[PDB]
Homo-oligomer: A and B are copies of this chain.
């Protein structure tokens, strides 16, 4: 007896465990004070955009012709915006992109949606995610009419279990989603991992008579520490689509600006780029926000104070390790992956909750027995949280 689409109703009515945890912390702040609530739940950028963002926005609003500034760009975005990104990427990675290899989008969620929508031709199409993973991939894959296949986590190094991956590749496999630097683990795939992946997928692509794409979800690319290198995947694998946004690099998550990069070395660039444009059109996208496209021209290479996040990583890692917790030291992103004190991460997160430590069970990310602790938080809160972490530890280790 439902007038609306049931999947849409479910997708809009489903309560987010993480968001509820965030709102629970605000309710707890009212009772015990915000200084006494240790909220490591939601993964929102916490450092301000570099000053070039606000300075450039001010300049466009003051000096750029208002009709031209606020008008529709082409579907794929201004050629000047696309040209500036192609040239920045070539100077940084040694690639050979031009403006026409880019399609400007309204953030990474739009870029991913476009990729699955462009690549899905059948109800039985499968996209592979490597656990632990961003759960919203299932919504985007399902929204395109396809299905998600999870590769069990490499809990030793948080790279890829290639045996497990190879076993889940079949005739229905359209692509493999990778997120490096990673949400939730903070892992960074090495050149070796990227090369083995590329060799495996090239080999399986030939066996099935069809390209298996790499869908590279790269919004944390510049959120990497200690000189660790994030390899540019298009250089290793021909059939690679790159999804990027300025949500983390420039701290503009609410502004909705990113891209889909379609290399010339894909099986048929003209055809795939056409499907990307068509998918964008089908999803109700007309163009990326014009003000932000024009602003991005002057912000290539610019990032916020990334060392603020590194300092938080080191502080949290040092304190948790010193207490006795087993933390995976992350090379990128702003999430720390910590082993729960019991196999049941949900039961462990409840015990954490008893001391107002709001951490997230990794079961939903495809990783039971672990938790995700976001450190895009206030540095002083991390220090004030240590006695509560110590007390939580004591509950298990008397």
A residues with CB within 8 A of B: 1-13, 44-49, 53-54, 57-58, 61-62, 66-67, 69-73, 106-107, 109-110, 112-114, 117-121, 139-140, 143, 210-211, 250-256, 267-268, 271-293
* Distance (whole angstroms) from the CB of A230 to the closest CB of chain B: 23
Q: What residues on B are CB-neighbors of A49 within 8 Å? A: 66, 70
User: What CA separation (Å) do A289 and B70 show in the bound complex?
Assistant: 13
Most chain B CB neighbours (cut-off 10 Å) among A9, A106, A281 = A9
Q: What residues on B are CB-neighbors of A271 within 8 Å? A: 2-4, 9
- Contact for A289 among B1, B46, B67, B255, CB less than 8 A: B255
Query: Is there an interface contact between A284 and B109, defined as CB atoms closer than 8 Å?
Result: yes
Query: Is there an interface contact between B61 and A47, defined as CB atoms closer than 8 Å?
Result: no
Q: What residues on B are CB-neighbors of A273 within 8 Å? A: 12
Chain B residue nearest to A106 (CB atoms) is B106
Q: What residues on B are CB-neighbors of A61 within 8 Å? A: 54, 57-58, 61
Could you jot down 11 A-B contacts, CB within 8 Å? A2-B121, A3-B210, A3-B267, A4-B118, A8-B279, A53-B70, A54-B62, A57-B291, A58-B61, A70-B251, A256-B286
Query: Is there an interface contact between B5 and A121, defined as CB atoms closer than 8 Å?
Result: yes
Chain B residue nearest to A5 (CB atoms) is B121
One complex includes copies of this chain to the number of 2
User: What CA separation (Å) do A11 and B273 show in the bound complex?
Assistant: 11
* Distance (whole angstroms) from the CB of A110 to the closest CB of chain B: 5
Query: Is there an interface contact between A48 and B66, defined as CB atoms closer than 8 Å?
Result: yes
Chain B residue nearest to A256 (CB atoms) is B289
Q: What residues on B are CB-neighbors of A6 within 8 Å? A: 121
Q: What residues on B are CB-neighbors of A280 within 8 Å? A: 12
Chain B residue nearest to A111 (CB atoms) is B284
Query: Is there an interface contact between B8 and A282, defined as CB atoms closer than 8 Å?
Result: yes
Query: Is there an interface contact between A12 and B284, defined as CB atoms closer than 8 Å?
Result: no
Most chain B CB neighbours (cut-off 10 Å) among A3, A252, A273, A290 = A3
Chain B residue nearest to A14 (CB atoms) is B278
Query: Is there an interface contact between B71 and A254, defined as CB atoms closer than 8 Å?
Result: yes
Query: Is there an interface contact between B277 and A72, defined as CB atoms closer than 8 Å?
Result: no
Query: Is there an interface contact between B284 and A283, defined as CB atoms closer than 8 Å?
Result: yes
User: What CA separation (Å) do A67 and B283 show in the bound complex?
Assistant: 29
Query: Is there an interface contact between B44 and A71, defined as CB atoms closer than 8 Å?
Result: yes
- In the complex, the 4 A-B pairs of residues with the closest C-beta atoms, listed nearest first: A254-B290, A113-B284, A12-B278, A11-B278
Chain B residue nearest to A13 (CB atoms) is B274
- Contact for A67 among B48, B71, B106, CB less than 8 A: B48
Given A5-B279, A58-B61, A72-B253, 8 other A-B residues pairs in contact with their CB atoms under 8 A: A2-B121, A8-B118, A9-B278, A12-B279, A48-B67, A70-B254, A71-B253, A256-B288
Query: Is there an interface contact between A66 and B54, defined as CB atoms closer than 8 Å?
Result: yes
User: What CA separation (Å) do A214 and B137 show in the bound complex?
Assistant: 33
User: What CA separation (Å) do A255 and B256 show in the bound complex?
Assistant: 10
* Distance (whole angstroms) from the CB of A75 to the closest CB of chain B: 8
Q: What residues on B are CB-neighbors of A9 within 8 Å? A: 271, 274-275, 278
Query: Is there an interface contact between B275 and A4, defined as CB atoms closer than 8 Å?
Result: yes
- Contact for A12 among B44, B62, B281, CB less than 8 A: B281
- Contact for A117 among B5, B67, B114, B267, CB less than 8 A: B5
User: What CA separation (Å) do A31 and B10 show in the bound complex?
Assistant: 57
- Contact for A291 among B11, B48, B255, B274, CB less than 8 A: B255
User: What CA separation (Å) do A364 and B397 show in the bound complex?
Assistant: 74
Q: What residues on B are CB-neighbors of A69 within 8 Å? A: 254
Chain B residue nearest to A211 (CB atoms) is B3
User: What CA separation (Å) do A141 and B113 show in the bound complex?
Assistant: 18
